[PDB]
Amino acid sequence: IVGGYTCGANTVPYQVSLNSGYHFCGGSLINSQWVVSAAHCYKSGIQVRLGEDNINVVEGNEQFISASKSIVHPSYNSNTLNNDIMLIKLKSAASLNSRVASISLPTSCASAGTQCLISGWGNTKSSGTSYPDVLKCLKAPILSDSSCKSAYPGQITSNMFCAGYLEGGKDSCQGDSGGPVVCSGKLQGIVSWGSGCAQKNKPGVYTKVCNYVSWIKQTIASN
């Protein structure tokens, strides 16, 4: 997260870190045994880390649970990043509490102008490289479809939306991938892609979660 703020320990209780020897992506806990992330975060040997603030220090509220299975969306295209969504099932159910909690799926899509919270452990620099240990947060509005398409000609599908600031300076970044965009207590977005981070006229692009609620529910019900 570039140009954000320190969230505060366990204030984003649905935020997870995906670990394969190291943090490599964010995710969102949507029930006691399932996490939503980005399809471009797919790899084998994933351990889901819940209740994290400092990802380099065991602080006492963590739950580490290995993934039993990952399900990349059937229509995910890694070239265009269309349908950039993946489900991860935990080998055992997380113990839910005030610091490890699920986030609700949307019942409706959020409109341009809606204020949201974007979070993660990604790079905090737009040019350099610096990775924080504690969770970073950014409040950002959803941008109009037209401004999003104008920013990225030929690249925005109906399964994507832009959020952030056309002036630059505030954005998600590398390592935030797969993490949450939450608006009014609903998971509306997944950190997907962009051209660099926090660059003028290049806002972050996010997977449009409301398009996937049926697939998510249906998949969980049979897996």
Ligand SMILES: NCCc1c[nH]c2ccccc12
């Ligand atoms: N807005 C951040 C989009 C993003 C995801 N992964 C990245 C890697 C490098 C640069 C940007 C990104």
Ligand SMILES: [Ca+2]
């Ligand atoms: Ca920790």
